[PDB]
């Protein structure tokens, strides 16, 4: 009650947007495993040039919204095993196409630096090594 | 003592700069005492004026503004006397420590030293008379002209001649233990001094030669080894580089018979006197060095806890602050009144504190005494107020200090104005009762992580996890607790045994509940696995605080007075009603437990205010509770350690009864946090306990292994309760209709349905009861049905344990 | 002792602004008024703060033969600590920039003198003089609590009102404190002129009026007057004084103008300042050199002596625009605190900015630690709320000391090329 | 027989591993030889772990010093040879590869003495213990039969003298026993003994000498050199017919002349006295850069203190001492 008491019947999309990112970011913060569902596909390790290349992007750009919508793509989007077949999310495409055409289907206000700036190397075969290496960063500007 | 006296006579700068212990301040003292015009101890000083002392301590941070404020207060008491019966002096100690500091104070000297004046109108009471006694080294341009004395070192011949005159006072016992340790100490001393950086004691030669000179004053004579000894292990024996024992041992091999006291009763002869049970003739003249104790991380207090100090003879302990208010000056002033009180009334002090205090007890520690009425009194002083306060004979102080902080950021001449000595939990094992501390921390592993070939969805562990406040020596501690507990007994067979059981079965007190079971899972029906069980719920309660308590009151031994219990929880801490329902069924044996959170309380004075409304009260049994959410950080520990203390000190003083007195410390912890983490085990009056929930909950049975015989189709079925198969089913209809989508979807039926189950799952009505009743019986056929489809039906209480990703859900 | 016993029997301890010139601080807002005993002949004595400390040291070394029924002292010891703590949070929150405080007088009496134990004054006509009775040092717990509390909120209002207002970045927490006070009268100062000559140039008291001709709006007076109307019917709704005073406070807080009238509220202030900027002139307009990118912030590494002539090439692209001042322009010394920086990073992501201008920080390296720190920090907030997108930001530092926190940290950004031009 | 990669063997056998492994563990071994709970076949899992818990359980207790063996009731030849196996193995010294630490290692024990005496009194003993043991025990019978040729040679270091003579008894038992299994021995012993309180007699008071000569280092009192030479050597590592002719059926170390070894004993019996060092050193006022030899020392300036107080002797034993000297001494 103390913690839902400032909120309304109209936040609960994106309450539901931060809790399930948050409770899952304690998880980063004890070296424990964020995602323990999800298939090992998506944990693959990113290249040292292509983590060159996202450090850049990650000191362009907020690191809420990004964080907050990919992990609603590591959450409801990669979590099924449907997406075996190319056809819903082929692990083999970039996560830049993937992000903005989530957005297309999520009707939502977009960032256009993230459409534009974001490497297109980043395969979402490598995408939740992206959220820890979006999520440490993140970490080491809380301290502080 | 002689130029001092002749500089202060006709007004001269003096400046005196030598080692540590040259008895600089030694000759301060008696000065002051002695001259003090017609009042004198003799005919000779009672014809020289009187002299005042202003005594300033200089400092890295000393302004400017301070040492003219201490010229301009040592002036106006010789405003309105006579100027050839009566002068004041300023002594600036330590006045090399302000030498090349930004804020450079020894530019007001040079004019200070002339006319007393900077720039204001001079006058024949502002010329006042200066010595300055430093360790450190000085510029002779920054003194006006005044005769500037260095002396260094005694090459060889003056430790020989201080040695005799230190030996000097029986003339008989001197030949008795000279001749052979007048010269040798010295060449062993020299050896010390320059085998060793980061200099070392020249105050701990001479109190060396006082030890043996003592000890020879014993029946007859001894100045033999296994006394001898000694008296040289207590020169510093916390250098861990400088073999004190070995260097004297390796240059004179007839005293090589040594016992090896450890470091252990050395602070026992240093505490409780030097003589066992009484020295030659009255205890007035052995004033032993005060005690500083090197530790890693802070054990050492615990260790003399459980050692020496039983009950009444405790010292009070001296802390900083944990509270979030009491700042530095105000809180300094608190902990310099209450080592006055000690002094006075001859109480022991531990001083936990750091080099705040160790600015003002800067000549108490420096043990020069001015006598009178057969009396020894000793200055302290607060900002500038410096005032001689008496001591009592049975004062002792000791100092715990972390090693590293005394190496590298304690000033050396504190370093040797006390006696050194390293207390580890290391060094106070013996070697068989060290080897179950290593056999504890490999069961441990074992018991954390079972080894299991067949199951492969494996969650590994921390210790911290399992026996939360897990450090690195709780093995340890757990350890000494046992032995201390057992007491001095010879080594039999059993007893590497039963102490290493006992050991085992306290370490267990603080293990969640889960890896109890988790452990009679993985290792399957396992002998150890079972009896760790059978421990950890049927003979060690650990259901509830309430069971804890009425268990703990009942089973505690009666020579006690005094009782702490720490409790570690992941539950809500105790409120109120749960207080309530504790004191309906505690009543007759205790009164109230008052119920105190600590993060509540803003001020240190409010806490013992508290606590002792708390303690001062008519009752026989006792029961407090302190209650701290560990929000995690640096934060709340020092609170809690800060608060730890406040409550046994005010235990050691309401101590006129025998009332028994329960304190408990709750700790509210989460399954997974985030920054720092929990360190119990503390050791010492402290036994970590974790109750998982501290109330008596209602909703199922309070001992959880009534679970691991029936299953969850069991609990629907009647025909005293494990579960509240009603509450259950009531607590869920808001969740169990949001899974219902009528076919149509014109339809918001679904906030009626709760509204009508809500009223529908009651036992008010004939009606409700026959709809619970047919309800949960059509439950528990489904159940039934669902159950023929698992493996191992019965044990659902381990595979909800195992499931590491569940737990972490719920706390 | 005894004079102890006198001030727990009767001890009138006053916190207010210091009066005169002199420096805030606790040395300066804390006297002690020890009063007539009844039936004696003393003065009714003053003490400083200085003159308490030593007592309180003089107490605490004189413990005596009867140290068995210290109360007199502990009494005294804690009443000491308890105003202290008041002191410091009045001190703080004056410094912060506070105005309802600027006239506040208390009365913390160490024992009740007729059924009062705290009195609280303002000094203002519309806000009625507070006196409550009971045990002084829990009064005084909960009405520090109450400040501090407050402290945060004002803070974060503060905060916003910098970030809605962009003219509110110009001037420190203070300087808006001297604006606010002297704009509103009879001709201000030549030093208020001078502060704001910065925005608009040779600004004069015509200025100043056509500026403030309409910086308020219509429903604030409204507004004010409502809350004027309504204030003693709160007051009376609440029976505690720390009830009563956050009513007081937080109306203060909202419509700051209806209790103390004279001075101007913050917003009115920063409309005040948008309006006389706008008279000002055509805003300059320069670039950032070849190799600087805008939307990112550049960081230029090079030798000390080099470091002054590599800041006026970053402007040195349009040789016709007014050199810069100390908008634009900072330069880091170790003394510079967290307010100069901050001054700077808003002033550079803020909207409400008419112009294009360069914002560059000179010796950054030299920073506090906890002063960049904060400054990093501050600059990442700014980004994820609202910003200018092309925010022109430049760091130059020794190239001795990279290895500081700033350049480090910024060490993402360096720019490769380092500005330079012939003498 | 479960296909043997679940574990049905191993957490089976740990269970029973565990029940053995809570009782005292004198009481396991003697479970382990007092009954017939292996009939044959010590091979399989069972009686191998059995083995294993045993011989922890004996490094354990052996470790502690405590007497296993004595006390110890036994029906099966195997079992008590499997434990006096690991007895040994595990009694010796961790760096059981020297001399000085092996010896102690025979002296100071009791249950190298008990295994010695059950190896003595029988052959099957001998039979049942293993080869490794086997070579451990002829390491030591070899080194005291060693220590013994020594000692009675008299060439053995100092350092053993005294640590035989420390445990005489335990010596002449196990080396009594040796020889029932495979005299002068005692006599040997004695003369060493002899020999070496006659070297400690003559070292203390040599060291008494020069301590009461550097009483007053301040002086000429230091000239030798070479008698602190022979001083400076070490008496551990020294052999005893070295420095000390030994007796068969006496000459010391340094070479004393014969000159000062009475005054040796004279101020030996006078080390402790404050009347002879007083006036010892009030005879050293007036003398002073010297150099000291024995010559000079012996003809005027050692005992004017020494006739002085047998004239003062004379004066206390008949009674007429003057009321001033009484005083000043």
Known sequence: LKALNRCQLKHTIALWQFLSAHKSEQLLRLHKEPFGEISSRYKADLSPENAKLLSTFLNQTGLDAFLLELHEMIILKLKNPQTQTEERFRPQWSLRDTLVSYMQTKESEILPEMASQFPEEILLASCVSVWKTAAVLKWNREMR | ?811 | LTLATAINQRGIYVIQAPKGGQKISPDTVLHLILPESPGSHEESREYSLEEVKELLNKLMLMSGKKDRNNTEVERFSEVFCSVQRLSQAFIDLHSAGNMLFRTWIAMAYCSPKQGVSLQMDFGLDLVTELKEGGDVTELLAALCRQMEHFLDSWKRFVTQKRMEHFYLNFYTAEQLVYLSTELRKQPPSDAALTMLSFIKSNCTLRDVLRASVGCGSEAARYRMRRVMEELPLMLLSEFSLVDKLRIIMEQSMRCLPAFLPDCLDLETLGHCLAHLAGMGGSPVERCLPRGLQVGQPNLVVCGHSEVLPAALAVYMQTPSQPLPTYDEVLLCTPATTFEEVALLLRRCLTLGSLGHKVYSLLFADQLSYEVARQAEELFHNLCTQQHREDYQLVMVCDGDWEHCYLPSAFSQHKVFVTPQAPL | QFPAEHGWKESLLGDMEWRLTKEEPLSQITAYCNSCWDTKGLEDSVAKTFEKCIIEAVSSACQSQTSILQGFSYSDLRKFGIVLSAVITKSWPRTADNFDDILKHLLTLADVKHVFRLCGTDEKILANVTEDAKRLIAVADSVLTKVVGDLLSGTILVGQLELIIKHKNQFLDIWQLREKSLCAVEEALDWRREELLLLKKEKRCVDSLLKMCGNVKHLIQVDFGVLAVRHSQDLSSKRLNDTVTVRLSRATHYHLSSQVQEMAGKIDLLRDSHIFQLFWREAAEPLSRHILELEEVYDYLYQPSYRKFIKLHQDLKSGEVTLAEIDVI
Request: hydrophobic share 40%.
């Open chain 2, 1 to 811: 003592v002689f130029m001092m006296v002749v500089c202060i006579e006709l007004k001269i700068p003096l400046f005196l700069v030598g080692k540590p212990g040259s008895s600089k301040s030694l000759a301060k003292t008696i000065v002051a005492d002695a001259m003090q015009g017609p009042a004198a101890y003799s005919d000779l000083f009672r014809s020289l004026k009187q002299v005042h002392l202003v005594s300033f301590q200089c400092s890295p941070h000393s302004t400017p503004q301070g040492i003219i404020s201490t010229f301009r207060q040592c002036a106006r008491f010789q405003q309105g006397k006579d100027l050839q019966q009566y002068v004041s002096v300023v002594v600036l100690d330590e006045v090399g420590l302000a030498e090349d500091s930004p804020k450079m104070p020894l530019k007001t000297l040079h004019p200070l030293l002339e006319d007393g004046c900077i720039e204001d109108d001079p006058a024949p009471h502002k010329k006042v008379g200066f010595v300055g006694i430093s360790n450190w080294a000085l510029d002779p341009a920054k003194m006006n002209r005044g005769i500037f004395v260095s002396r260094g070192s005694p090459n060889e011949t003056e430790l020989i001649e201080s040695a005799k005159g230190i030996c000097s006072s029986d003339i008989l016992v001197q030949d008795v233990a000279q001749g052979y340790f007048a010269s040798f100490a010295k060449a062993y001393e020299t050896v010390c001094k320059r085998q060793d950086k980061e200099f070392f004691g020249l105050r701990d030669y001479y109190s060396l030669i006082k030890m043996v000179f003592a000890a020879a004053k014993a029946s007859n004579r001894k100045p033999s080894p296994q006394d001898i000894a000694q008296a040289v292990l207590r020169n510093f024996s916390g250098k861990d580089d400088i073999q004190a024992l070995d260097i004297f041992l390796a240059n004179l091999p007839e005293a090589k018979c040594s016992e090896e006291v450890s470091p252990m009763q050395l602070i026992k002869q240093n505490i409780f006197g030097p003589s066992q049970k009484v020295p030659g003739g009255e205890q007035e003249d052995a004033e032993s060095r005060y005690l500083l104790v090197l530790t890693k991380n802070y054990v050492a207090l615990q260790i003399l806890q459980q050692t020496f100090f039983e009950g009444d003879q405790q010292p009070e302990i001296i802390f900083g602050s944990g509270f979030p208010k009491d700042q530095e000056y105000t809180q300094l002033c608190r902990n310099i009144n209450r080592v006055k009180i000690c002094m006075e009334t001859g109480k022991m002090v531990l001083l936990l504190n750091l080099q705040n205090l160790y600015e003002s007890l800067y000549d108490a520690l420096n043990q020069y005494y001015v006598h009178l009425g057969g009396q020894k009194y000793v200055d302290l002083g607060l900002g500038t107020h410096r005032v001689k306060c008496r001591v009592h004979p049975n004062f002792r102080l000791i100092v715990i200090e972390e090693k590293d902080v005394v190496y590298k950021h304690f000033p050396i001449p504190l370093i040797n104005r006390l006696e050194k000595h390293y207390l580890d939990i290391n060094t106070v094992l013996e070697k068989w009762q060290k080897s179950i501390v290593e056999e504890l921390c490999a069961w441990v592993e074992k018991f954390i992580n079972v080894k299991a070939h067949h199951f492969q969805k494996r969650h590994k562990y921390s210790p911290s996890d399992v026996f939360i406040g897990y450090h690195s020596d709780a093995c340890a501690s757990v350890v000494l607790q046992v032995i201390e507990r057992q007491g001095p007994r010879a080594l039999t067979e059993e007893l590497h045994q039963k102490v290493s059981e006992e050991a085992k079965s306290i370490l267990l007190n603080c293990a969640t509940p889960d890896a109890v079971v988790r452990l009679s899972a993985y290792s399957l029906g396992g002998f150890a696995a079972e009896w760790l069980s059978q421990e950890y719920f049927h003979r060690q309660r650990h259901n509830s605080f309430a069971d804890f308590l009425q268990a703990h009151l009942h089973t505690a031994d009666l020579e006690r007075h005094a009782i702490f219990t720490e409790i570690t929880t992941f539950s809500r801490l105790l409120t109120s009603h749960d207080c309530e329902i504790l004191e309906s069924e505690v009543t007759g044996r205790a009164p109230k437990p008052t119920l105190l959170w600590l993060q509540q309380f803003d001020t240190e004075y409010s806490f013992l205010k508290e606590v002792r409304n708390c303690l001062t009260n008519t009752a026989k049994c006792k029961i407090l509770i302190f209650q701290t959410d560990f929000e995690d950080g640096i934060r709340s520990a020092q609170l809690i350690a800060s608060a730890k203390y406040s409550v046994i000190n005010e235990i050691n003083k309401i101590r006129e009864n025998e009332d028994r007195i329960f304190v408990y410390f709750i700790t509210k912890l989460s399954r997974v946090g985030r920054g720092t983490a929990y360190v119990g085990f503390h050791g010492g009056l402290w036994q970590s306990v974790h109750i998982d929930d501290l109330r008596r909950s209602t909703l199922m049975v309070s001992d959880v292994t009534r679970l691991q015989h029936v299953t969850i189709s069991q609990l629907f079925a009647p025909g005293v309760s494990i579960l509240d198969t009603t509450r259950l089913l009531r607590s869920c209809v808001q969740s169990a209709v949001g899974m219902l989508r009528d076919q149509n979807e014109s339809c918001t039926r679904n906030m009626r349905r709760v509204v009508l189950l809500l009223g529908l799952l009651n036992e008010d009505d004939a009606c409700h009861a026959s709809f619970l009743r047919v309800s949960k019986m059509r439950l528990s056929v489904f159940l039934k049905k669902q159950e023929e489809s698992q493996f191992h039906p019965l044990e659902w209480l381990a595979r909800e344990a195992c499931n590491q990703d569940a737990l972490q859900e719920a706390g």
